[PDB]
Write an enzyme that holds these catalytic residues in place. Sequence first.
Site, PDB file in Angstrom:
ATOM      1  N   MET A  86     -71.904  92.560   5.653  1.00 59.52           N
ATOM      2  CA  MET A  86     -73.090  93.631   5.377  1.00 59.52           C
ATOM      3  C   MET A  86     -74.406  93.259   5.853  1.00 59.52           C
ATOM      4  O   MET A  86     -75.328  94.025   6.710  1.00 59.52           O
ATOM      5  CB  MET A  86     -73.173  93.838   3.684  1.00 59.52           C
ATOM      6  CG  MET A  86     -71.944  94.493   3.335  1.00 59.52           C
ATOM      7  SD  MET A  86     -72.283  95.123   1.519  1.00 59.52           S
ATOM      8  CE  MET A  86     -72.333  93.428   0.745  1.00 59.52           C
ATOM      9  N   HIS A  87     -74.811  91.932   6.023  1.00 63.69           N
ATOM     10  CA  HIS A  87     -75.875  91.342   6.609  1.00 63.69           C
ATOM     11  C   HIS A  87     -75.948  91.759   8.024  1.00 63.69           C
ATOM     12  O   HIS A  87     -76.868  92.157   8.735  1.00 63.69           O
ATOM     13  CB  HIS A  87     -76.259  89.730   6.619  1.00 63.69           C
ATOM     14  CG  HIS A  87     -77.047  89.423   5.122  1.00 63.69           C
ATOM     15  ND1 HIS A  87     -77.138  90.499   4.199  1.00 63.69           N
ATOM     16  CD2 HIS A  87     -77.142  88.494   4.496  1.00 63.69           C
ATOM     17  CE1 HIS A  87     -77.643  89.824   2.960  1.00 63.69           C
ATOM     18  NE2 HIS A  87     -77.737  88.418   3.447  1.00 63.69           N
ATOM     19  N   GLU A  88     -74.827  91.565   8.877  1.00 67.49           N
ATOM     20  CA  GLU A  88     -74.514  92.057  10.255  1.00 67.49           C
ATOM     21  C   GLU A  88     -74.955  93.348  10.392  1.00 67.49           C
ATOM     22  O   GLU A  88     -75.553  93.798  11.587  1.00 67.49           O
ATOM     23  CB  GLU A  88     -73.235  91.660  10.745  1.00 67.49           C
ATOM     24  CG  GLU A  88     -72.638  90.391  10.926  1.00 67.49           C
ATOM     25  CD  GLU A  88     -71.578  90.184  11.545  1.00 67.49           C
ATOM     26  OE1 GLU A  88     -71.645  90.390  12.688  1.00 67.49           O
ATOM     27  OE2 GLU A  88     -70.713  89.509  10.886  1.00 67.49           O
TER      28      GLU A  88
ATOM     29  N   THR B 190     -79.152  94.165   2.714  1.00 70.07           N
ATOM     30  CA  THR B 190     -77.907  93.890   1.414  1.00 70.07           C
ATOM     31  C   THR B 190     -77.964  92.511   0.806  1.00 70.07           C
ATOM     32  O   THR B 190     -78.517  91.711   1.402  1.00 70.07           O
ATOM     33  CB  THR B 190     -76.519  94.163   2.027  1.00 70.07           C
ATOM     34  OG1 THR B 190     -76.453  93.490   3.120  1.00 70.07           O
ATOM     35  CG2 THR B 190     -76.361  95.780   2.158  1.00 70.07           C
TER      36      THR B 190
END
Lengths: 226, 244, 247
Positions: free
Chosen positions: C228-230, C136
């Site tokens: 979102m990166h997680e 993302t």
Amino acid sequence: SVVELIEIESAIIQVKMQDRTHKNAFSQELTDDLIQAFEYIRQNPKYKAVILTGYDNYFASGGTQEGLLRIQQGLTDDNLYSLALDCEIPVIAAMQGHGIGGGFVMGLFADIVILSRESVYTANFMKYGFTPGMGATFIVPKKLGFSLAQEILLNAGSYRGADLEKRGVPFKVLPRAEVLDYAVELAQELAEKPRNSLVTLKDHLVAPLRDQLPRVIEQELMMHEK
Amino acid sequence: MTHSVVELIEIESAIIQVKMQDRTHKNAFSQELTDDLIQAFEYIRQNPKYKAVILTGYDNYFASGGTQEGLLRIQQGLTDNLYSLALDCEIPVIAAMQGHGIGGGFVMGLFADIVILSRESVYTANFMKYGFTPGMGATFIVPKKLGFSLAQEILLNAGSYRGADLEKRGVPFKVLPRAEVLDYAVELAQELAEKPRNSLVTLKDHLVAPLRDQLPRVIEQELMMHEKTFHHEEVKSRIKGLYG
Amino acid sequence: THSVVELIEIESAIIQVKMQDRTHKNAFSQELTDDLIQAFEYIRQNPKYKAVILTGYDNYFASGGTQEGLLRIQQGLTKFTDDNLYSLALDCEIPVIAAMQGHGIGGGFVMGLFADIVILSRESVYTANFMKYGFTPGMGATFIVPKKLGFSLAQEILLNAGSYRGADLEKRGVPFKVLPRAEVLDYAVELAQELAEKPRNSLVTLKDHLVAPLRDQLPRVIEQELMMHEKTFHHEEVKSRIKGLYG
């Protein structure tokens, strides 16, 4: 069925509205079949993208005549810039000529703004050393968009209507000689609506402006004074 | 208008033109123009026979803003929800509007993540042609997608625009000949389909959360407008007389 | 560290920050990161300038994460907030002009978008290409792209990660001035000169007022982008895309 489902490649689903009888108006059938089409998509996590489309020359027509009739029956230095804004009815700012500073901003508060290609438009406050007043700092980003407004306001530059048109503004831009006539035509089309519908709708569209303008003016006053 | 700097002209019965004509000051805000403008709008407010106002200047001047004298004084310190089907879909939706989009059908497509228009087709949020206020979330999604200013005209006037006219007015939607619209949608969809599904859904969820969050309050406000405008005999005749 | 950013005082009140990491084509190397921060700190400590011009070299404005840099996030060694480049132009007290005479890719495109004025080159390529690698958008793209380009174009830009020439954006209707590459920096200079005609205090007061909602709202969006990166960054198939598609 009046909606056809077509897979494209692996993970694309096309939803094709084909109620030919009703030219994709919202018949009972199209309504039910659309709902079921999206429910099917929701139950299927193969798909990554949906193409919603119509048939021939129709995308979608809106309420059918009988469906509209069913609803009908019930089955179903601190003021002048906002004159246009506080006006109950739609105001067209037909800027056939130059709009400079507070004159430009005053017109930007109208519901419909028409520019002339040959004229000069500027929020020129900062040219005098002053931070902008008259709600400029609110109405410019709101009508012209945040990004163009930073330029207009920081630089206080002068643009011809022709420049603003090439920069991409949402306002109709015409030769000066045509500006008024276009406004009268647009006014005539507006006057075809019930006056209560015009006022009800404008009240709803400009409520966030009428609601937030006072605090923006207070912040603009605090910028002077510094 | 008193100071004679603002002339009122009625056009027909329901249109008033406010013409600014302070020739001496080139429509800068002199005392007279200020008082005459305020008087003109007060006149309008007390005469609700008018439905539209045209505010205009004279010759090459609309309005020149603060006077030079005024400005110097300051420097010097002396002064079933069809409409949200695309929005609730977890994956990206492309409205390929290869044909006409009218009223709720137009609005329904505007909730897609990507909208493509046809040059030849006609688009209209035509609710107000029948006398009633726009529904289906139009008063939210039209400004959200097309910007506040163009949405005002679209919603208030219920005009019909070819895809080519909107493209000229500056919409962010791709506009193509009808015969290219679906091919281009499929190419775009194939490009989106190159992404992991989980990344597409996570990003959509995030990009449209404020629309999913705000839409229900806007729908409520549109219902409030429909209660006030839908149930008048005049709306019934416009539906009978003006439909298609 | 230490010569990949050149600072030129172009006139008494105008400073140009020119990125010229030729080895990395203005991708965010360690050296580029450090010099950019240092150059903006210098501007903050010397409050005599009225305008900053941020620009690149030859055909490159800024290229975003280096491949190594992306793979470290993927591995979970780092996150994109570790060094904050994304918001340099926003945090700057004075107006910043992003003169994108060359390509603007990923974090390099988005960093430029936080400037108060953005100018694009017609023949250069611009892309928020995060999603092409399967993760993302970060660097505040999901806030600044819709803010500057409008909700509708940002959807497409962010979801599809497609590349656009300046000419393509121009055609799609962006509020940025789009010029032939050869005119971009001179036009930035002229606009900086018109800006430098105002009092410095007025320019700072006005920018503070215009960008206050951005400075207030950005930190919540950056947190959501970290979330979102997680969920999306630490998959195997992201490593495969970084390794397979970078360039």
